């Protein structure tokens, strides 16, 4: 008969539109209370820290987060910058290149990514 | 000279000396494919078409063995069925091997074997 496929429907439709959705919702609310929940979008999860440290352990990605990464010979760059600043230093100015860069790198933003203290 | 050249950057590359390249023994005018070194047949060093330059040899040797093993059985099967060796049970009077495939898939015994080969191959896929 044209029916006889409803034997499959009477099991599949209740299953996949009631049992599977209910199990999925229960599993989702259970997953919501894991410490790993939404670790890719929610800040301050343990797995995020472990993944970042794992990336940092790779020899290629050691100095990857540094915005100044790339200077093949930073000593040459610093020496050239110091020489160029010496010829342009205003009168009896007492600022050197080294401490100027050191104090231009050190800013005061305590409340930046402070969420790296729980997980 | 196993290496393709000797340099530090591929703009000032120093290609290896022509008489010093390793070279394949099968195709004498081609350099030896170093990816094949270690595997069983890697003494005739035969890979033109460069299909091991792109695909992990583990795959190809898996495919090479499966083809050879399946052909060793198929050759024996065709020879025996042609010489006349039909299985002891009846319903196996296919008269000729060329029509054995269509005859047996009609009878219903090929669908069984395809299932048994299928499950073992799915198990093979997990193994591979």
């Amino acid at each position: 008969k044209y029916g006889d496929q409803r034997k499959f429907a009477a099991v599949l439709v209740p299953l996949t539109t009631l049992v599977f959705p209910a199990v999925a919702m229960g599993m989702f609310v259970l997953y919501s209370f894991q410490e790993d929940a939404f670790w890719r979008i929610v800040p301050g999860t343990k797995r995020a820290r472990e993944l970042d440290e794992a990336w940092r352990e790779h020899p290629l990605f050691a100095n990857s987060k540094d915005p100044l990464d790339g200077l093949i010979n930073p000593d040459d760059y610093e020496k050239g910058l110091e020489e160029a600043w010496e010829r342009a230093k205003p009168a009896g100015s007492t600022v050197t290149v080294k401490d100027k860069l050191k104090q231009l790198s050190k800013q005061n933003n305590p409340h930046w990514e402070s969420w790296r203290a729980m997980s | 000279x196993x290496x393709x050249x000797x340099x530090x950057x591929x703009x000032x590359x120093x290609x290896x000396x022509x008489x010093x390249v390793k070279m394949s023994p099968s195709v004498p005018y081609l350099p030896y494919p170093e990816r094949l070194e270690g595997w069983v047949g890697g003494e005739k060093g035969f890979d033109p078409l460069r299909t091991s330059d792109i695909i992990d040899v583990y795959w190809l040797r898996e495919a090479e063995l499966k083809h050879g093993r399946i052909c060793m059985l198929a050759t024996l099967g065709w020879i025996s069925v042609d010489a006349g060796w039909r299985f002891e049970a009846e319903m196996f009077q296919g008269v000729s091997v060329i029509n054995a495939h269509n005859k047996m898939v009609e009878m219903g015994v090929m669908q069984q074997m395809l299932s048994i080969v299928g499950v073992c191959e799915i198990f093979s896929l997990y193994l591979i």
Partner: protein, 86 residues
């Protein structure tokens, strides 16, 4: 927690400090303006984000800028009353 940053264009109005409803901002001495003072945000963990400080700032573009971070909200940055997160 949000991010409240003070820029050099500050002229020591103190209006941003007075407008803050949770004592996030404060006045610190400086030497970059005639008022000899610039704002600071030492307690942005208490910054709800009302942006009243930005409303009160009279520089051409705000010397104080509040950057909202919604995936960062704490109980103080949300102003939770019925519920404690500590």
């Amino acid at each position: 927690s949000h991010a409240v940053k003070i820029y050099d264009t500050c002229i020591g109005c103190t209006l941003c400090v007075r407008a803050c409803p949770t004592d996030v901002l404060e006045m610190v001495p400086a030497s970059i303006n005639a008022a000899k003072q610039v704002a600071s945000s030492p307690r942005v963990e208490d910054c709800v984000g009302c942006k009243r400080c930005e409303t009160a700032c009279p520089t051409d573009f705000l010397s104080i800028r509040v950057y909202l971070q919604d995936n960062e909200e704490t109980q103080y940055s949300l102003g939770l009353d019925l519920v404690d997160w500590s």
